[PDB]
């Protein structure tokens, strides 16, 4: 069966490979994160609960009073989303938390409490997320993009000898907490271990061990093994240890023989020694001369330390120890190659001998220039780590920390302990000695995703700790009674962090609203920049590159090209975030032999230790792999594996690409550069007047369109009971009506609203009266959607041939009938505001009487001085008339004479009115006025308020009466049984439905409850109506000093013209060069012209031959459509129509799709055929597209040639072009780079203040920057005069430029160059120092 919205127009689907997992909800990261942020979590670990638990309760010094946290809630927002957008205010909810203050008494620190005071305190407003994933911050719609940051834990890296010519590699271990300090270890070229807290001055590592109260003997015990001796002078031999020996003495066991001197000990010698059970040997005294004593060995006779631990053991020391009775000694076992000595050398360099000295050195390191205090140093050390208030190793941090050190406890403390540091040091030593491997910093198993619901929590916690410190300081003094827990808290400290994060942050940016695709792809975007993340100045390479771990998680293609390329990525289609924030992707599990149907979401690190078969792998009808060997990707590489040793399989062929790159048909045939460009450009298409579905698509259009949120999707099934250009009323089915509901839903459509890019956001219904619907069906397709499918461009008939140099480099030649039919005409809505302020000389006024206006420009203004709604204005017309008082303005002599002669008075008021910008021409569609609370509300404002109140009352009344109709219908339905009245029921009036007599049964109770519900509706309606009248008729909170504002909205309609930029989906962009008459375009033998002519020379170099395949397949699809259209015009019975459509819907080699028309009623078949008369839509999945043979077969089904090339004639002369050319249908886009937004010219204008140069930008009417390279170019020529006039007269020669202007308007082209202003400013600035720079004559 097919969906009702989908059986109107079924898209023929190639794509042999079957589908097992449905595409998920695209923008789910945002919604899940923010839902977690604001949510009552019983075991507080998410969102606001976690922050409150972490901070509160706050204890004052000596514990006299305690401030406790109880609960929190969010009040309902005062303004809804639309009113926030109109009013230019944030959409947010106020946070109210129940605090409780308890005061203690002497002798009862925790016993009886003097008093407890509960109160709700309001601390800030938190912005709320809209149901699509956006925030309304100041009327504008923002998006907060996720962040990819290196996760906390412990990471072992090296420098692979880059900095050393010796080629040695210096390993280093770093510990990164979620918040705290970076305890960093490292090696030294001399194999001296070092530690650098917070990347400060380096210190020997062992210091910290002493700072943890460790003695030298304990250190050597931890990090080293030991050997022993007995006395004469017998040694207990361990065969394994002597892996390399014989340098001094081979062996002496049992006397006779075990091995000879000189020859190096081999494995056979060890085998013989272990077989013989060698446990005692004799060695020469000199052999021990090179060993190092392990522990302390004092002269027991005299109680004198002969040799401290870790000291070279010499023969004289041997004699002294023997005299002391030390018949046994411990020496640190260390073989140079494997068990190298590294801590011992650090001890040799150790400038400390006890805890106090180490603490003093640490104290000096952390805070220099301070006196080392015995009490302060220990406190600083114990506070740096080991404290819950200054150091947090998060749950993900702890998980990765334990996993890296190969432990079994996933959970643990967030604060470092001695065991952790010892284990990290031992791990680093193991890595250096040759066991283990270093970590990879680009592995997506080491990088984590932060999302808005976590960054907001972090900022809120920052504010909360600030307020906690403030309240602690406040409690430190006084601690009097009658101090409620509400005078110590001010909202502003907490609200500042939140509103700064949401308002001015790196990761919080205006949404892209070109089309649904741009919004969808902006919401699911990942950024490596932002706070806590690297910067473009020093980021790559080797982090901008694509890693093998991105497969299935981050898109390889879609990335911006420019300064930040590879630092901003796009989430793949099926990618999902782990519980800890790591991207994961789904794989269909494979049992012994069968490819089961249950998916497991595997992560980067977890994925390495399996072998995953490819998605494009043939499977039998039972589920077995057909091929004996299957190509699958192992740990890092891909190769052939036996059919019986695969344990996972890819879930789809589009699993690797993002949504933007999965909308390109024939992506396999496009070069990677061109695919990247094509995705980036496809994000920029401008919606046109009428939407046009792609004739060749990939099947991802409907998902993007529905999940984008631009459509109106039914929430429950029913029957369309009312349709209109502005609303849809659906009558729900009985099966989903709920007990006490009327069962009617109302969808109100968005009509001609402005987007962030100054485009049009218009929804229009695509249903009709009496049409059934089911939940999930689209009811009103928004901008750039067609019956529920994304439709960014138009299907143009294109030919690939040169044609006279009008498509020379990348230019496009467009027909004049593409402009007659308004196919690329777009509507742009722009806002203009006219703010009147109270100036020093008096207030400004908005009036229709303006000084020195000839009454020609005042026609469109109404009596109040504001343009009429619906008026058509052009550049220079006045929209709002304003006047500003001015000063005396002494009149020059001659002007005084002119006034005397003609007796004219002074205006006394300026003309600072709002007028349409030059070059624009549109119609006024909306005017809205904002006025301060204490003003008069000129007639126009009162009229606008009257109409707004009428609209509000009408909306509420229509709601109430439609719901009354539904309720009374349901009551009448219920009145069919249990005391049924049929003929007499309708006699009495409807108001008496509530007072109907019925048997003493539950049905009468139900009717009474419904009547009470209707009364509740009445009461709610009246209350809401009064509140809405109050809300409409009130003042406004404008800036300080502004009396009122008037905003005018112009709807401009832009037609395509030479200079506009067009593009396809394959990275083939161009600029229109000519609009050619219809009778000049090339035509075929049936007389049909060609819409667009493209240059074939563009295809070979840019190896994107997916456009040629798209053109062939579009030709085939339009041929099928033309055949259907011909059969439909000739009035042929439904039998042949059905037979042909069925024949066309089953082509190809074992395609997955199967549509059977025998189950379609004649009405359904005719509607389908009428929707297919412009071409049969075709779906070509990303890496599972249509084969060329299938394209040839589909061309052959129509009567077209299978070559894809026809014979064309020249319109100008009628002679046929030789060597036939390729014509077809290609999907063309109109990118948002319009020539009328880019043409800029300047003769003279306004100049900057401090430096008298022309202003910059098109908005300011600025000039062109003439840089240093252009100066070099003019010096390469001998153009000294051009250079001089560009340096002085044209830029900042204040009195030379007016002379030049006067000379030009006097017919004399000569300049007096003078000296620029910048040099004078430079002289004054150099002189403002002590220097004396002058201009000698």
């Amino acid at each position: 069966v097919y969906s009702y919205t989908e059986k109107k127009r079924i898209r023929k689907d190639f794509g042999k490979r079957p589908q097992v997992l449905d595409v998920p909800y695209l923008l789910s990261i945002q919604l899940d994160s923010f839902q977690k942020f604001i949510e009552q979590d019983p075991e507080g670990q998410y969102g606001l609960e976690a922050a409150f638990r972490s901070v509160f309760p706050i204890q004052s010094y000596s514990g006299n009073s305690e401030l406790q946290y109880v609960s929190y809630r969010l009040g309902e927002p005062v303004f809804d989303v639309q009113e926030c957008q109109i009013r230019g205010v944030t959409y947010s909810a106020p946070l109210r938390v129940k605090l409780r203050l308890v005061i203690y008494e002497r002798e009862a620190p925790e016993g009886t409490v003097k008093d407890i005071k509960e109160q709700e305190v309001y601390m800030g407003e938190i912005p709320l997320m809209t149901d699509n994933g956006t925030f309304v911050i100041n009327g504008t719609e923002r998006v907060i993009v996720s962040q990819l940051h290196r996760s906390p834990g412990v990471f072992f890296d090296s420098d692979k000898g880059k900095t050393h010519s010796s080629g040695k590699v210096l390993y280093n271990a770093r510990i990164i907490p979620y918040r705290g300090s970076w305890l960093d270890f490292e090696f030294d070229p001399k194999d001296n271990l070092f530690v650098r807290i917070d990347r400060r001055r380096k210190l020997p590592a062992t210091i910290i061990l002493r700072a943890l109260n460790y003695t030298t003997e304990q250190i050597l015990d931890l990090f080293f093994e030991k050997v022993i001796f007995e006395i004469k002078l017998q040694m207990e031999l361990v065969p394994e240890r002597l892996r390399g020996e014989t340098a001094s003495f081979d062996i002496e066991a049992n006397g006779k023989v075990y091995v000879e001197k000189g020859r190096r000990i081999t494995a056979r010698h060890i085998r013989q020694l272990e077989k013989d059970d060698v446990k005692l040997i004799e060695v020469p005294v000199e052999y021990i001369a090179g060993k190092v004593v392990a522990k302390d060995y004092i002269d027991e006779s005299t109680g004198e330390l002969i040799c401290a631990a870790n000291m070279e053991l010499s023969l004289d020391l041997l004699a002294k120890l023997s005299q002391s009775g030390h018949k046994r000694i411990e020496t640190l076992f260390t073989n140079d190659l494997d068990h190298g000595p590294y801590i011992s050398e650090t001890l040799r360099v150790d400038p400390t001998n006890d805890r106090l000295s180490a603490l003093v050195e640490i104290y000096r390191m952390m805070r220099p220039g301070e006196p080392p205090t015995r009490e302060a140093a220990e406190s600083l050390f114990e506070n740096l780590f080991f404290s819950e208030d200054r150091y947090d190793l998060s749950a993900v941090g702890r998980m990765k920390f334990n996993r890296s050190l190969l432990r079994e406890e996933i959970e643990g403390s967030g604060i470092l302990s001695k065991d952790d540091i010892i284990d990290v040091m031992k791990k680093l030593i193991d890595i250096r000695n040759g066991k283990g491997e270093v970590d990879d910093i680009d592995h997506l198993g080491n990088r984590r995703i932060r999302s808005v619901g976590e960054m907001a929590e972090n900022q809120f916690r920052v504010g909360l700790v600030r307020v906690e410190r403030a309240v602690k300081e406040r409690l430190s003094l006084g601690d009097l009674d009658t101090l409620m827990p509400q005078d110590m808290i001010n909202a502003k400290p907490i609200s500042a962090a939140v509103k700064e994060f949401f308002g001015s942050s790196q990761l919080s940016q205006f949404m892209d609203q070109n089309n649904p695709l741009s919004e969808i792809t902006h919401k699911r975007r990942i950024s490596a920049l932002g706070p806590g993340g690297l910067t473009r100045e020093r980021a790559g390479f080797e982090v901008r590159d694509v890693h093998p771990t991105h497969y299935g998680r981050v898109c390889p293609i879609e990335t911006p090209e420019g300064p930040n390329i590879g630092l901003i990525n796009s989430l793949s289609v099926y990618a999902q975030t782990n519980e800890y924030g790591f991207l994961e992707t789904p794989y269909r599990k494979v049992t012994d032999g069968v490819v089961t149907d249950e998916i497991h979401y595997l992560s980067a690190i977890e994925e390495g230790n399996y072998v995953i078969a490819q998605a494009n792998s043939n499977l039998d009808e039972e589920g077995h792999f057909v091929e004996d060997l299957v190509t699958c990707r192992s740990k890092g590489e891909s190769s052939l594996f036996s059919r019986d040793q695969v344990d996972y399989m890819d879930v789809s062929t589009q699993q690797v690409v993002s949504v933007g790159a999965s909308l390109i048909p024939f992506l396999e045939h496009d070069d990677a550069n061109r695919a990247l460009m094509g995705a980036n450009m496809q994000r920029q298409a401008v919606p046109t007047l009428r939407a046009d579905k792609p004739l060749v698509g990939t099947g991802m259009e409907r998902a993007v369109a529905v999940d984008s949120g631009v459509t109106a999707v039914a929430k429950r099934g029913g029957v369309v009971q009312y349709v209109d250009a502005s609303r849809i009323v659906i009558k729900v089915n009985e099966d989903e009506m709920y007990p006490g509901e009327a069962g009617i839903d109302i969808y109100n459509l968005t009509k001609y609203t402005r987007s962030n890019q100054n485009t049009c956001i218009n929804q229009m219904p695509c249903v009709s009266l009496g049409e059934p619907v089911e939940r999930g069906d689209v009811l009103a397709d928004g901008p750039s959607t067609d019956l529920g499918e994304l439709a960014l461009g138009q299907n143009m008939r294109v030919a690939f041939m040169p044609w006279n140099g009008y498509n020379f480099e990348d230019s496009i030649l467009v027909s004049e009938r593409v402009v007659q039919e308004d196919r690329f005409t777009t509507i742009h809505i722009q806002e203009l505001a006219c703010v009147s302020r109270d100036t020093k000389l008096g207030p400004e006024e908005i009036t229709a009487d303006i000084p020195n206006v000839g009454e020609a420009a005042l026609s469109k203004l109404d009596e109040s001085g504001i343009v009429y709604i619906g008026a058509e204005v052009t550049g220079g017309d006045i929209l709002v008339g304003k006047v500003t008082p001015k000063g005396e303005t002494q009149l020059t002599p001659e002007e005084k004479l002119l006034r005397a002669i003609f007796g004219e008075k002074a205006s006394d008021v300026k003309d600072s009115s709002l007028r349409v910008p030059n070059g624009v021409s549109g119609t006024v569609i909306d005017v809205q006025v904002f006025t301060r609370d204490g003003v008069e509300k000129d007639k126009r404002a009162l009229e606008i308020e009257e109409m707004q109140l009428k609209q509000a009352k009408k909306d509420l009344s229509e709601e109430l009466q439609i719901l009354e109709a539904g309720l009374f219908s349901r009551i009448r339905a219920v009145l069919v049984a249990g005391g049924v009245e049929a003929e007499k029921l309708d006699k009495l009036p409807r108001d008496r439905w509530l007072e109907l007599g019925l048997t003493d049964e539950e049905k009468q109770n139900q009717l009474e409850q419904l009547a009470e519900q209707y009364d509740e509706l009445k009461h709610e309606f009246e209350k809401k109506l009064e509140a809405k009248r109050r809300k409409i008729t009130q003042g406004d909170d404008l800036a300080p000093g502004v009396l009122k504002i008037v905003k005018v909205y112009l709807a401009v309609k832009r037609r395509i013209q030479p200079g506009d930029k067009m593009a396809g989906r394959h990275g083939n962009k161009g600029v229109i060069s000519k609009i050619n008459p219809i009778e000049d375009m090339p035509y075929d033998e049936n007389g049909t012209p060609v819409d667009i002519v493209l240059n074939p020379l563009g295809v070979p170099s840019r190896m994107n031959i997916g456009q040629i395949l798209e053109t062939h397949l579009g030709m085939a699809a339009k041929g099928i459509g033309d055949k259907i259209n011909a059969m439909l015009k000739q009035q042929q019975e439904v039998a042949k129509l059905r037979e042909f459509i069925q024949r066309a819907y089953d082509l190809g080699a074992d395609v997955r799709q199967k549509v059977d028309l025998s189950t379609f009623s004649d009405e359904e078949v005719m509607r389908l055929a009428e929707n297919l008369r412009k071409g049969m839509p075709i779906a070509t999945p990303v890496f599972d597209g249509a084969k060329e043979a299938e394209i040839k077969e589909l061309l052959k089904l129509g009567d077209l040639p299978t070559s894809g090339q026809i014979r064309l004639y020249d319109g100008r002369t009628g002679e046929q072009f030789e060597r036939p050319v390729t014509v077809g249908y290609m999907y063309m886009l109109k990118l948002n780079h319009l020539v009328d937004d880019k043409m800029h010219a300047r003769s003279t204008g306004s100049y900057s203040l401090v430096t008298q140069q022309p202003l910059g930008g098109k908005a300011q009417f600025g000039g062109q920057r003439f840089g240093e390279m252009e100066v070099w170019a003019l010096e390469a020529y001998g153009a000294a005069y051009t250079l001089q006039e560009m340096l002085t007269v044209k830029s900042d020669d204040v009195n030379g430029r007016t002379k030049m202007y006067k000379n030009i308007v006097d017919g004399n082209h000569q300049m007096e160059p003078g000296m620029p202003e910048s040099f004078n400013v430079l002289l004054k600035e150099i002189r403002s120092l002590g220097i004396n720079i002058e201009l000698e004559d």
Binding site: E809, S811, K1069, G1070, M1239, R1265, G1278, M1286, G1307, L1329
Partner: protein, 251 residues
């Protein structure tokens, strides 16, 4: 300087001068009270620090910051750097009588001429049109000429065509790598809003027609016009200056 509303904008030098003057006046006051030498020594150290910050901030110690928590710009900072008077404003600056727009093909042109939109040509040559209108008697004063060009009457376009007759314009593309990135052409007035560029010159500019833009400047003086005609014309530069080979080859 006052901004719109009750707000102001000020340079960082006002803060530094205020600090210097405050500390100097405080020291002068302090030397009359006969304070302990500790206080006067501290005051003199502070005065030295403030004068140091004024002359050059962030060179001896820590840079003094403002309310925005950014380091204040000093006198030295206003001279050095890529954003100083020596580089940002003295060797390259914004210019009058200039425009920019997107470029199209125009394959019908001759090697020495380009296509200039009528609107851009009207805006760039306004003083010339005023002079011509006054000279020919169509307008009485310069205000009448202004109103005539603002209404875009019929005579205005004939006057514009007369002004443009033999008046080169310099076309330039942003990455000016060699001297052939600026060339002088003769305008031909066209409809639309895109500049038509002769195909054979594209290689000199390294320009393609997939969205590129060009800037147009108009020489003013007689000397500048003659230099554009005799030195920078496009029919004078047909050989590369790096070698002798032509740079006007069909592409």
């Amino acid at each position: 300087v006052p901004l719109d509303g009750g707000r102001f904008a000020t340079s960082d030098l006002n803060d530094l001068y205020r600090r210097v003057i405050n500390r100097n006046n405080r020291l002068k006051r302090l030397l009359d009270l006969a304070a302990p030498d500790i206080i006067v020594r501290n005051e003199k150290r502070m005065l030295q620090e403030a004068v140091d910050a004024l002359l050059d901030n962030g060179r001896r110690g820590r840079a003094i910051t403002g309310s925005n928590k950014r380091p204040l710009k000093s006198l030295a900072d206003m001279i050095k750097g890529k954003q100083g008077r020596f580089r940002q404003n003295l060797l390259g600056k914004r210019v009058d009588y200039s425009g920019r727009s997107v470029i199209t093909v125009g394959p019908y042109l001759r090697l020495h001429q380009c296509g200039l939109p009528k609107k851009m040509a009207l805006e760039l040559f306004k003083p010339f049109i005023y002079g011509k209108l006054e000279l020919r008697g169509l307008a009485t004063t310069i205000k009448a000429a202004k109103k005539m060009v603002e209404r875009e009457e019929a005579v205005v376009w004939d006057i514009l065509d007369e002004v443009i007759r033999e008046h080169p314009v310099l076309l330039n593309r942003a990455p000016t790598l060699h001297r052939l990135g600026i060339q002088a052409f003769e305008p031909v007035l066209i409809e639309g809003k895109a500049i038509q560029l002769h195909p054979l010159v594209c290689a000199a500019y390294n320009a393609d027609f997939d969205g590129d833009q060009m800037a147009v400047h108009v020489p003013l003086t007689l000397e500048a016009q003659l230099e554009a005609r005799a030195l920078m014309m496009s029919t004078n530069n047909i050989l590369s200056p790096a070698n002798g080979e032509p740079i006007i080859v069909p592409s």
